[PDB]
Design an enzyme around this catalytic site. Sequence first.
Site, PDB file in Angstrom:
ATOM      1  N   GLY A  35      76.710   4.786  68.855  1.00  0.00           N
ATOM      2  CA  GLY A  35      76.945   5.038  70.268  1.00  0.00           C
ATOM      3  C   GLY A  35      78.416   5.385  70.503  1.00  0.00           C
ATOM      4  N   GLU A  76      85.436   2.682  67.926  1.00  0.00           N
ATOM      5  CA  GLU A  76      86.684   2.398  68.608  1.00  0.00           C
ATOM      6  C   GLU A  76      87.947   2.856  67.874  1.00  0.00           C
ATOM      7  OE1 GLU A  76      84.566  -0.019  67.350  1.00  0.00           O
ATOM      8  OE2 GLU A  76      85.727  -1.779  66.695  1.00  0.00           O
ATOM      9  N   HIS A  84      82.947  -0.338  76.642  1.00  0.00           N
ATOM     10  CA  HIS A  84      82.879  -1.079  75.392  1.00  0.00           C
ATOM     11  C   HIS A  84      83.996  -0.668  74.426  1.00  0.00           C
ATOM     12  CE1 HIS A  84      80.712  -3.387  72.251  1.00  0.00           C
ATOM     13  NE2 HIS A  84      81.343  -2.539  71.463  1.00  0.00           N
ATOM     14  N   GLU A  85      84.056   0.631  74.124  1.00  0.00           N
ATOM     15  CA  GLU A  85      85.039   1.185  73.199  1.00  0.00           C
ATOM     16  C   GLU A  85      86.453   0.918  73.682  1.00  0.00           C
ATOM     17  OE1 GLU A  85      84.046   1.688  70.457  1.00  0.00           O
ATOM     18  OE2 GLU A  85      81.930   2.029  70.880  1.00  0.00           O
ATOM     19  N   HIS A 116      87.526  -2.693  72.962  1.00  0.00           N
ATOM     20  CA  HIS A 116      87.951  -2.830  71.563  1.00  0.00           C
ATOM     21  C   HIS A 116      89.458  -2.630  71.323  1.00  0.00           C
ATOM     22  CE1 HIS A 116      84.529  -3.838  69.199  1.00  0.00           C
ATOM     23  NE2 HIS A 116      83.824  -2.758  69.492  1.00  0.00           N
ATOM     24  N   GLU A 171      82.618  -8.021  68.104  1.00  0.00           N
ATOM     25  CA  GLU A 171      81.609  -7.506  69.020  1.00  0.00           C
ATOM     26  C   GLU A 171      81.340  -8.403  70.223  1.00  0.00           C
ATOM     27  OE1 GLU A 171      81.178  -4.712  68.985  1.00  0.00           O
ATOM     28  OE2 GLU A 171      81.776  -4.136  66.962  1.00  0.00           O
ATOM     29  N   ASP A 209      76.162  -2.463  56.243  1.00  0.00           N
ATOM     30  CA  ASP A 209      75.356  -1.489  56.961  1.00  0.00           C
ATOM     31  C   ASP A 209      73.912  -1.965  57.107  1.00  0.00           C
ATOM     32  OD1 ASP A 209      77.491   0.159  57.408  1.00  0.00           O
ATOM     33  OD2 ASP A 209      77.066   1.545  55.768  1.00  0.00           O
ATOM     34  N   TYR A 253      76.564  -8.764  68.578  1.00  0.00           N
ATOM     35  CA  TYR A 253      76.880  -8.354  69.949  1.00  0.00           C
ATOM     36  C   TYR A 253      76.351  -9.336  70.997  1.00  0.00           C
ATOM     37  CZ  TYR A 253      77.920  -3.704  67.963  1.00  0.00           C
ATOM     38  OH  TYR A 253      78.415  -2.676  67.195  1.00  0.00           O
ATOM     39  N   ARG A 305      71.834   9.221  66.267  1.00  0.00           N
ATOM     40  CA  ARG A 305      72.272   7.881  66.621  1.00  0.00           C
ATOM     41  C   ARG A 305      71.275   6.884  66.034  1.00  0.00           C
ATOM     42  NH1 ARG A 305      73.563   5.970  72.827  1.00  0.00           N
ATOM     43  NH2 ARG A 305      74.391   3.872  72.396  1.00  0.00           N
ATOM     44  N   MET A 306      71.755   6.015  65.142  1.00  0.00           N
ATOM     45  CA  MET A 306      70.873   5.092  64.424  1.00  0.00           C
ATOM     46  C   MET A 306      70.046   4.231  65.363  1.00  0.00           C
ATOM     47  SD  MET A 306      72.969   3.826  61.083  1.00  0.00           S
ATOM     48  CE  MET A 306      74.288   3.034  61.996  1.00  0.00           C
ATOM     49  N   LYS A 307      70.635   3.848  66.490  1.00  0.00           N
ATOM     50  CA  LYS A 307      69.938   3.093  67.526  1.00  0.00           C
ATOM     51  C   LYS A 307      68.621   3.744  67.955  1.00  0.00           C
ATOM     52  CE  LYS A 307      70.553   1.249  72.214  1.00  0.00           C
ATOM     53  NZ  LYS A 307      71.524   1.027  73.318  1.00  0.00           N
TER      54      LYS A 307
HETATM   55 ZN   LIG Z   1      81.747  -2.760  69.447  1.00  0.00          ZN
END
Ligand SMILES: [Zn+2]
EC number: 3.3.2.6
Length: 607
Positions: free
Chosen positions: A265, A268, A292-293, A296, A315, A372, A380, A560-562
Amino acid sequence: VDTCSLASPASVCRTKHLHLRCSVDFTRRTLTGTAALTVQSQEDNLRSLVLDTKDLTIEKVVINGQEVKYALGERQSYKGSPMEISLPIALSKNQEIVIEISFETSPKSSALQWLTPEQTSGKEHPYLFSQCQAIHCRAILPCQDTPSVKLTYTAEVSVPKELVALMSAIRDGETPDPEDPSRKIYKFIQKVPIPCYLIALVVGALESRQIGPRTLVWSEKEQVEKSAYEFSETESMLKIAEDLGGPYVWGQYDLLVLPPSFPYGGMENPCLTFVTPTLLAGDKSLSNVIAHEISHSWTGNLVTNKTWDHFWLNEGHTVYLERHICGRLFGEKFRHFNALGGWGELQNSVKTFGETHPFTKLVVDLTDIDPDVAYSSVPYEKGFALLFYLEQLLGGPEIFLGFLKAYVEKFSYKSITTDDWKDFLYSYFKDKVDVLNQVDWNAWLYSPGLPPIKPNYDMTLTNACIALSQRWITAKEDDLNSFNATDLKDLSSHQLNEFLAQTLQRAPLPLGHIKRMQEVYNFNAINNSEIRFRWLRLCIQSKWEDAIPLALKMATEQGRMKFTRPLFKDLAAFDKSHDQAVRTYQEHKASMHPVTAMLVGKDLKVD
Ligand SMILES: [Zn+2]
Ligand SMILES: [Yb+3]
Ligand SMILES: [Yb+3]
Ligand SMILES: [Yb+3]
Ligand SMILES: [Yb+3]
Ligand SMILES: [Yb+3]
Ligand SMILES: [Yb+3]
């Protein structure tokens, strides 16, 4: 000691500075150059040291004008190969040397994705981007690839002159390449000491647009206009964050909007946050990722986890800060909405791994585990849940934000463990040691599954989401024509998203329900990536054959892995789409991001 690292630990020596001179070779798909590491001994009579590498080709090592001896051990999987370097003379404590390693990356560097022109928006130029967190910087250059060491850096990157290079650093100028008339050299300087996972590079046909006094957005021209609008609130978020965490120390805060295969997503990277183009909903509703970023820049980049076992420090605090930013922007009720949604996500990841699974622990021992593979929303949302719980236990958000800022100041420029954090928590709240002592710390920190205690959540903005979800879930066939496009009329896109999240948790629904939902709500036409994602999962898990091409399409046309991982898993679990999904993975595998390709392959059991 950092069990994810094969390098000499910080107790032995510390890298203080990196000067990278390299050239980006698109024909060979290699970074070629020299990493000059300024290393300081932490020990008397130091005669050698070991660095992390991974699929690096070492050309030569030079210390003080002379080549020196080095050797590489066997490759230890994702950990790479240790590189031992014999020093030309023994060092006293605090003594420094400059080690100049010449090297080439492999085209299969797990840190990098090389894009062909057709994999870009403009279709005329290639594109390169890096992603080092957690331990991929070793696949870019020799280093002590551990967040327990922090270093400044400078870089000079040569690229084809029609292209642009950017790094997690302050732009320091550009010249033609003295050795090559068809190339340009971009210079960079990072004056704030960082862990090496925050090193980042991109090279491509980038354009820039100014959107704040300290913020440019960079992307391919096709995405710049949309991005400038989508992230227009960045400076406001920056200012709020400075109120919460103290001064932004990094100078610039630029955004890079990557091509669709970017695996996260956001990332940072200091001075230059990386973000997925899937954030481009058209209404800024996914800009919490920006909050969020931004956050960080304090929690993570200033105060850093000492090892990846303590990743939740990074996180958890960042999500806490993130939701405070959103709260100041849109209200405390909204902060609770997002917080409650976070708990929902935690429920999910715990159900996915299972409630006894080690990866649902807050603090995890990653000795023989690829970071990973362990990566999930647990650090989070269990992290956030712990902090949100403490906030309520200790007197509210004003008081707990007092702690947050003190915490950031206390540990700025440092690398810490869960124990350092808790020690300071107790020191800061020494007057409430007796309340703190009632906390099930061992359960919270080290037990798998849902946390021992759920915080209290304001329900105000979530209720309409719950009500509509429950109507769909309890609805029978003769209730279906009672649903109407007007159901969505007073719902924000967040509320739409939360409605879909609530409903997805109860999937599958009858085919008839799903088909009606498309009839009246037309989620097929929604641009919002989060909403479309949950909708397509709902469809696939409800066995709607018609949704299969859309699902396959989303899973592959972005990366995006999400989104890509759960869509592929959902498609693999549905008999009608299983072989099609596995077949599509294998045809796209070679052109996927290396980490994403690895995880999906594992997710689908394709070996
Ligand atoms: Zn983060
Ligand atoms: Yb020693
Ligand atoms: Yb000595
Ligand atoms: Yb092609
Ligand atoms: Yb300059
Ligand atoms: Yb302690
Ligand atoms: Yb009925």
